Amino acid sequence: RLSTLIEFLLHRAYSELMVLTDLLPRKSDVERKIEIVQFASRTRQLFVRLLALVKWANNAGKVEKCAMISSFLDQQAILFVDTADRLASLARDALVH
Amino acid sequence: ESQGIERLHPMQFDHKKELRKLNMSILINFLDLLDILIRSPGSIKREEKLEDLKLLFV
Amino acid sequence: HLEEHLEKFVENIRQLGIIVSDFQPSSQAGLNQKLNFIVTGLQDIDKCRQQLHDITVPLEVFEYIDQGRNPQLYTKECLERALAKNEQVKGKIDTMKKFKSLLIQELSKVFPEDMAKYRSIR
């Protein structure tokens, strides 16, 4: 990751703000209102990101438990697949003799 | 079967006795394979038993 | 779980500040710089928390976030995987039990030597 995307969005917003303030000496009241609306939209996006982070942290321990269970299940499935491959090789691949 | 490797069957070489021994070996191999599949795949004796059974059949 | 409460409080405070300063600010518009600094501080705090906790950040959450869908699909997939794993474990246990029972029955009906072998040596 979240830090990567957070820093990328922050750098993009900073570059946009710098490019918009470079020509600040020619901004009117309508331009100020448009900038305020853009800042409000950015704040709404940040609030939505914070709400998403909160919803993800509210189910983070369960997510970690499910990931550990999935890893254990993948290990068990790999062991079962190896056993099945050995049985198949012993029963239908080495019966030439 | 009595020369080259360990000789377990006696000089009788009875058809019924050999068939019962082969059936017991196959049952033991299947039981070991099932136990390995159920508990843990850390047992590789199943493939060795299957190769031994194939050599005995040959 | 204080990061979520802190983020919610920061968002509420930013919304209140925007609603209060929605008027005509004659001074320099420092609101954008203040929001950028607050976002940078929040990102740094979240990184510090994730490094102190050292949680296993998976790629599936990031993929589902970049895709633009809900985590309900991932939850259903994990539930189906857990159900399939439980069913496979139950099937393996039942197959092992049936194999043991059939071997014991065949030994008792044919040769007790194999039964004694499977019961003591195995």
GROMACS .gro file of N, CA and C in nm, chain A residues 3 6-7 10 17 35 38-40 43 46-47 50-51 53-55 57-58 64 66-67 73, chain C residues 1 3-5 7-8 11 14 18 31-32 35-36 39-40 43 47 56-58 78 81 85:
model
  138
    3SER      N    1   0.205   0.119   0.060
    3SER     CA    2   0.292   0.236   0.066
    3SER      C    3   0.336   0.281  -0.072
    6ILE      N    4   0.046   0.460  -0.231
    6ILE     CA    5   0.023   0.584  -0.156
    6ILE      C    6   0.124   0.690  -0.197
    7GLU      N    7   0.253   0.654  -0.200
    7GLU     CA    8   0.356   0.747  -0.243
    7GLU      C    9   0.341   0.788  -0.389
   10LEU      N   10   0.061   1.038  -0.397
   10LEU     CA   11   0.106   1.162  -0.334
   10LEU      C   12   0.196   1.241  -0.428
   17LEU      N   13  -0.040   1.979  -0.830
   17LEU     CA   14  -0.054   2.104  -0.756
   17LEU      C   15   0.054   2.203  -0.795
   35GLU      N   16  -1.034   2.488  -0.811
   35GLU     CA   17  -0.928   2.428  -0.731
   35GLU      C   18  -0.982   2.376  -0.598
   38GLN      N   19  -1.155   2.054  -0.673
   38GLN     CA   20  -1.058   1.947  -0.695
   38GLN      C   21  -0.999   1.899  -0.563
   39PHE      N   22  -0.970   1.993  -0.472
   39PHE     CA   23  -0.921   1.954  -0.340
   39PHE      C   24  -1.025   1.876  -0.261
   40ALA      N   25  -1.153   1.913  -0.274
   40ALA     CA   26  -1.259   1.838  -0.207
   40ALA      C   27  -1.272   1.698  -0.266
   43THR      N   28  -0.988   1.500  -0.124
   43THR     CA   29  -1.017   1.463   0.014
   43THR      C   30  -1.120   1.351   0.021
   46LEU      N   31  -0.935   1.037  -0.057
   46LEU     CA   32  -0.855   0.995   0.059
   46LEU      C   33  -0.944   0.933   0.166
   47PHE      N   34  -1.063   0.989   0.187
   47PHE     CA   35  -1.156   0.932   0.284
   47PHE      C   36  -1.203   0.794   0.240
   50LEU      N   37  -0.924   0.559   0.313
   50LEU     CA   38  -0.918   0.530   0.456
   50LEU      C   39  -1.028   0.433   0.497
   51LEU      N   40  -1.148   0.449   0.441
   51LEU     CA   41  -1.257   0.357   0.470
   51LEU      C   42  -1.226   0.217   0.419
   53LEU      N   43  -0.921   0.093   0.385
   53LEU     CA   44  -0.819   0.042   0.476
   53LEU      C   45  -0.880  -0.006   0.607
   54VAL      N   46  -0.981   0.067   0.656
   54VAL     CA   47  -1.049   0.026   0.779
   54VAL      C   48  -1.125  -0.104   0.758
   55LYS      N   49  -1.193  -0.117   0.644
   55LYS     CA   50  -1.266  -0.241   0.614
   55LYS      C   51  -1.171  -0.358   0.597
   57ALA      N   52  -0.864  -0.381   0.753
   57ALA     CA   53  -0.810  -0.410   0.885
   57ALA      C   54  -0.912  -0.473   0.978
   58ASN      N   55  -1.041  -0.449   0.956
   58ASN     CA   56  -1.144  -0.513   1.036
   58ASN      C   57  -1.154  -0.663   1.010
   64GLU      N   58  -0.540  -1.340   0.764
   64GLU     CA   59  -0.414  -1.409   0.788
   64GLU      C   60  -0.437  -1.555   0.825
   66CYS      N   61  -0.695  -1.738   0.731
   66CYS     CA   62  -0.736  -1.807   0.608
   66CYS      C   63  -0.618  -1.828   0.515
   67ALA      N   64  -0.522  -1.735   0.513
   67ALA     CA   65  -0.404  -1.753   0.430
   67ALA      C   66  -0.317  -1.867   0.482
   73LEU      N   67  -0.335  -2.620   0.330
   73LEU     CA   68  -0.411  -2.700   0.234
   73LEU      C   69  -0.332  -2.721   0.106
  156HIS      N   70  -0.634  -0.265   1.694
  156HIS     CA   71  -0.688  -0.210   1.570
  156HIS      C   72  -0.717  -0.061   1.584
  158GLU      N   73  -0.537   0.176   1.395
  158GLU     CA   74  -0.512   0.246   1.269
  158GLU      C   75  -0.642   0.282   1.199
  159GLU      N   76  -0.740   0.192   1.201
  159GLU     CA   77  -0.869   0.221   1.138
  159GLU      C   78  -0.941   0.335   1.208
  160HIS      N   79  -0.942   0.335   1.341
  160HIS     CA   80  -1.006   0.443   1.415
  160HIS      C   81  -0.935   0.576   1.390
  162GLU      N   82  -0.765   0.658   1.119
  162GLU     CA   83  -0.795   0.701   0.983
  162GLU      C   84  -0.936   0.758   0.973
  163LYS      N   85  -1.032   0.694   1.040
  163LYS     CA   86  -1.169   0.746   1.040
  163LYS      C   87  -1.176   0.883   1.107
  166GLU      N   88  -1.027   1.139   0.872
  166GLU     CA   89  -1.118   1.170   0.762
  166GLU      C   90  -1.233   1.259   0.809
  169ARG      N   91  -1.095   1.608   0.857
  169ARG     CA   92  -1.071   1.674   0.729
  169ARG      C   93  -1.203   1.719   0.666
  173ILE      N   94  -1.300   2.105   0.590
  173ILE     CA   95  -1.340   2.149   0.457
  173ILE      C   96  -1.475   2.218   0.462
  186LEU      N   97  -0.445   2.453   0.221
  186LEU     CA   98  -0.522   2.332   0.248
  186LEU      C   99  -0.467   2.212   0.172
  187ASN      N  100  -0.426   2.233   0.046
  187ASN     CA  101  -0.371   2.123  -0.032
  187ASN      C  102  -0.241   2.071   0.028
  190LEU      N  103  -0.320   1.882   0.350
  190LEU     CA  104  -0.374   1.749   0.321
  190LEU      C  105  -0.264   1.655   0.272
  191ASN      N  106  -0.172   1.705   0.190
  191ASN     CA  107  -0.061   1.623   0.143
  191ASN      C  108   0.028   1.580   0.259
  194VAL      N  109  -0.154   1.317   0.462
  194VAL     CA  110  -0.154   1.188   0.393
  194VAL      C  111  -0.017   1.122   0.403
  195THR      N  112   0.090   1.201   0.391
  195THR     CA  113   0.224   1.146   0.405
  195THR      C  114   0.248   1.092   0.546
  198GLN      N  115   0.054   0.768   0.582
  198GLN     CA  116   0.121   0.659   0.512
  198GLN      C  117   0.244   0.612   0.589
  202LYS      N  118   0.294   0.240   0.742
  202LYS     CA  119   0.412   0.160   0.712
  202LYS      C  120   0.482   0.116   0.840
  211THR      N  121   0.168  -1.073   0.700
  211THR     CA  122   0.190  -1.132   0.568
  211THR      C  123   0.092  -1.069   0.470
  212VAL      N  124   0.136  -0.959   0.409
  212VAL     CA  125   0.055  -0.887   0.311
  212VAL      C  126   0.049  -0.970   0.183
  213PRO      N  127  -0.065  -1.029   0.150
  213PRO     CA  128  -0.074  -1.112   0.029
  213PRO      C  129  -0.101  -1.027  -0.095
  233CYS      N  130  -1.222  -1.877  -0.086
  233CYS     CA  131  -1.154  -1.935   0.029
  233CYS      C  132  -1.245  -2.033   0.103
  236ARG      N  133  -1.255  -2.346  -0.103
  236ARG     CA  134  -1.130  -2.420  -0.089
  236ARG      C  135  -1.123  -2.492   0.044
  240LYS      N  136  -1.105  -2.892   0.095
  240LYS     CA  137  -0.998  -2.954   0.173
  240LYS      C  138  -1.055  -3.044   0.282
   0.00000   0.00000   0.00000
